[PDB]
Enzyme design. Structure first.
Site, PDB file in Angstrom:
ATOM      1  CE1 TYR A   1      -5.964   3.954  11.223  1.00  0.00           C
ATOM      2  CE2 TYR A   1      -5.174   4.215   8.977  1.00  0.00           C
ATOM      3  CZ  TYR A   1      -5.041   3.643  10.231  1.00  0.00           C
ATOM      4  OH  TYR A   1      -4.009   2.778  10.436  1.00  0.00           O
TER       5      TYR A   1
ATOM      6  CG  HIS B   1      -1.957  -1.015   1.191  1.00  0.00           C
ATOM      7  ND1 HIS B   1      -3.257  -0.794   1.492  1.00  0.00           N
ATOM      8  CD2 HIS B   1      -1.869  -2.291   0.768  1.00  0.00           C
ATOM      9  CE1 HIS B   1      -3.943  -1.918   1.300  1.00  0.00           C
ATOM     10  NE2 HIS B   1      -3.121  -2.819   0.842  1.00  0.00           N
TER      11      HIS B   1
ATOM     12  CE  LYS C   1       4.405   3.050  13.034  1.00  0.00           C
ATOM     13  NZ  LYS C   1       3.647   2.730  11.776  1.00  0.00           N
TER      14      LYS C   1
ATOM     15  CE1 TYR D   1      -1.167   4.414   9.491  1.00  0.00           C
ATOM     16  CE2 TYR D   1      -0.283   3.576   7.391  1.00  0.00           C
ATOM     17  CZ  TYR D   1      -1.233   3.562   8.405  1.00  0.00           C
ATOM     18  OH  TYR D   1      -2.255   2.662   8.305  1.00  0.00           O
TER      19      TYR D   1
ATOM     20  N   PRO E   1      -3.508   0.664  19.238  1.00  0.00           N
ATOM     21  CG  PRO E   1      -5.340  -0.869  19.257  1.00  0.00           C
ATOM     22  CD  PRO E   1      -4.699   0.288  20.007  1.00  0.00           C
TER      23      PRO E   1
END
Ligand SMILES: Cc1cc2nc3c(=O)[nH]c(=O)nc-3n(C[C@H](O)[C@H](O)[C@H](O)COP(=O)(O)OP(=O)(O)OC[C@H]3O[C@@H](n4cnc5c(N)ncnc54)[C@H](O)[C@@H]3O)c2cc1C
Ligand SMILES: Cc1cc2nc3c(=O)[nH]c(=O)nc-3n(C[C@H](O)[C@H](O)[C@H](O)COP(=O)(O)OP(=O)(O)OC[C@H]3O[C@@H](n4cnc5c(N)ncnc54)[C@H](O)[C@@H]3O)c2cc1C
Lengths: 394, 394
Positions: free
Chosen positions: A201, A72, A297, A385, A293
């Site tokens: 998200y 991705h 990570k 990220y 979460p």
């Protein structure tokens, strides 16, 4: 028995290090409490940053993930209005992330470990650590009545949060820091149904939602929920209706549902012990720290420390020296914190806390507007990220 | 009397708009409660972002600030370890900031206004607004017993926080949002002593300190202090010893003290009303919002809205139309929030709150490490410090 490194914990941390060490020539023995099923029923993570991929690379889960894992290049963040795309590669200086799946990278390490001939005492109850600060530590587990004794040189705790290494460290020798966030996460692994293509998200006022993948006809969804509020209470149908409820035009004719691959669950917090060391004990992973979460990570966290644990072990063994092995908690704590930080920000810009005054939520909205807007804003997201840089040594 | 725009408030907002309008040909009358001394004894700001400079430029405080104001290309932020420089110009895409001084930009507007012949009723007690939503508003002040009446077309509130325009707005028509932060700021304007050359911001565990300038032999210093804790209690000597106390190697042989140019004070918070409008009333500046002093915003805040108030007034007057003048609170609220945000972050990464658990402060330390470290980190700081972009219109 006698081995070099004795590992308490067959999760991925335990396996990688074991499965790293082996390849170098430093015999290890994994010591696990459960059965090879229970660890394999454990369905968690889906996102692995590169470096934990390169690590897998520098051992073995090349074949299957080079083969089966969606690479991705971006994520999307929606926040009452619309969906906003990040483009990790052009924001991150050229990096990305792969959604392989935790339980898979785990089955490959049990795969590859199995064929090397490297030891793994499954169903080992009563593990206990003896002689930490000593010149020759020893671990003790029960395989019957049959209390056995394994003398090692070094003990690496890859036990996870609820392990026995951490507690076996003279408390005044440790320093805890932790935030128990007020909401858990309700997961729903469904497979028959196809996904919505990147990660979405979401900051919806009914709480946070999260559409994710495992395969191309496999989904991973979560929705924020209050605590201990029972799952026995959720439903497939009641899930499908609330997820839908917190999304935009991604949510209807677009989304496809089904019964849940009987995977449904809970909870989150941030926790960190300092130092991650004691005599000849080394914590790795959830034994040492816990990160919410939300910034994908945790596993990625455990990889980066399993990394130092291992290179630090090379030089001990193979070179001559390694008091360098004292400088471990030092390297690892750097990264755990920028990562803990990245994790709470994410947690708190996307989640909906029981509290906000029209300022805190006014603040909350504006920061999303700002970061999802600014290019300097966006690159601070991207950079963290995919993964911050890794680490020093020598 | 009859004028176009009736301004309640001779601070800089009131003056600029007045002093903007005049130049265009839209007669205004300033209506001020105090004397031209009391407003001039008001010693505040030192930092003006460009745009508020260009604005001053597009009127008058060219001469003296082109002449007397230190143009700055960077700031430094210290945080237990050392000093870290920002380089606003190369981080901001090429912008900077000037430390002119609020009380100065104010004396120039009273200067220039005085010579145009534009009206200013000083010592005007009992100001009152009548007919807001009406087609012809009117303002009323007492210059004796002598209750006078000034019919205007538009009333612009540049009254400041404790003004009378805001309250004269049907409360259900407004929406407040505010955070009263737990500490004030102790200022100390000293002049005999030279400064330390750029701005030094500081995160020391005894609280926050701030070394600033006004001239090349004029200093502006502040130190965070708890509330209402009396200034009558501080000292020059007790100030000099605590400031010193929160700094590095900038603080000794380097710093020079003296008696304070009898300037010493207090307090901070964040506040915002929404909407900033009512019929023919327009709030501007501290009347509408309050931002913590820490990101050198507030005056810079009032400039950017005094700007829209004025361009919006041009088109009303000069073009034909201006319901565009309804779209005011719209333009201004965009910017006030990214600015409110920038202000709290600064406030909260640098300040020392009575609360932190080793996580909140662990978090606090790491975010500084991260932003002062990352280039994407740094450019998010720079970009906001100098000023976000300004605004649309039409
Ligand atoms: C909902 C959710 C989503 C997440 N998503 C992501 C994501 O997308 N990306 C990402 O990078 N991370 C993610 N994470 C993080 C991830 O869960 C973990 O960080 C990762 O599994 C680290 O696991 P671990 O090795 O420490 O141990 P664990 O997975 O807990 O394994 C510990 C092992 O030790 C064994 N053990 C326990 N006690 C003993 C004992 N006394 N003796 C011997 N053995 C013992 C256990 O049986 C177990 O096998 C997510 C977490 C959650 C909860
Ligand atoms: C310690 C400190 C440092 C700061 N530093 C900076 C900095 O470095 N850079 C920066 O950009 N900003 C800074 N600020 C922000 C700055 O203080 C203000 O935002 C700026 O002065 C805006 O002022 P204002 O026009 O709203 O009104 P004010 O300065 O309050 O003026 C309002 C005017 O209205 C008049 N008035 C009041 N009531 C009435 C009434 N009923 N009728 C008629 N007239 C009335 C008053 O007499 C006064 O003349 C700082 C603030 C503080 C406290």
């Amino acid at each position: 028995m006698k081995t070099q490194v004795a590992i308490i914990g067959a999760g991925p941390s335990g396996l990688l290090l074991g499965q790293l060490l082996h390849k170098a020539g430093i015999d290890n023995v994994i010591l696990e409490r459960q059965t090879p099923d229970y660890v394999l029923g454990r369905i968690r993570a889906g996102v692995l940053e590169q470096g934990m991929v390169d690590l897998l690379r520098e051992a073995g889960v090349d074949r299957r993930m080079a083969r089966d894992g969606l690479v991705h290049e971006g994520v999307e963040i929606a926040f009452a209005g619309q969906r906003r795309r990040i483009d990790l590669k052009r924001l991150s200086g050229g990096k990305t992330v792969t959604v392989y799946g935790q339980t898979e990278v785990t089955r490959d390490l049990m795969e590859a470990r199995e064929a090397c001939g490297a030891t793994t005492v499954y169903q080992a109850a009563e593990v206990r650590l003896h002689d930490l600060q000593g010149e020759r530590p020893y671990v003790t587990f029960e395989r019957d009545g049959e209390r056995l004794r394994l003398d090692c040189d070094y003990i690496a705790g890859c036990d996870g949060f609820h392990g026995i290494s951490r507690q076996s460290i003279p408390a005044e020798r440790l320093k805890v820091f932790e935030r128990v966030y007020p909401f858990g996460w309700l997961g729903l692994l469904a497979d028959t149904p196809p996904v919505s293509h990147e990660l979405i998200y979401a900051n919806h006022p009914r709480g946070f939602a999260l559409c994710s993948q495992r395969s191309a006809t496999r989904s991973r969804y979560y929705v924020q929920v209050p605590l201990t509020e029972k799952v026995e209470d959720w439903s497939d149908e009641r899930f499908w209706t609330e997820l839908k409820a917190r999304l935009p035009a991604e949510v209807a004719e677009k989304l496809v549902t089904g019964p849940s691959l009987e995977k449904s669950i809970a909870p989150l917090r941030s926790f960190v012990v300092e130092p991650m060391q004691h005599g000849r004990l080394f914590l790795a992973g959830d034994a040492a720290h816990i990160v919410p979460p939300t910034g994908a990570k945790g596993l990625n966290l455990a990889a980066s420390d399993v990394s130092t644990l291992y290179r630090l072990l090379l030089k001990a063994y193979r070179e001559g020296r390694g008091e360098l092995l004292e400088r471990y908690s030092a390297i690892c704590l750097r990264r755990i914190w920028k990562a803990e930080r990245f994790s709470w920000w994410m947690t708190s810009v996307l989640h909906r806390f029981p509290d906000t005054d029209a300022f805190s939520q006014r603040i909350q909205q504006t920061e999303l507007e700002y970061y999802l807007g600014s290019e300097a804003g966006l690159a601070t997201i991207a950079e963290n990220y995919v993964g911050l840089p890794y680490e020093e040594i020598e």
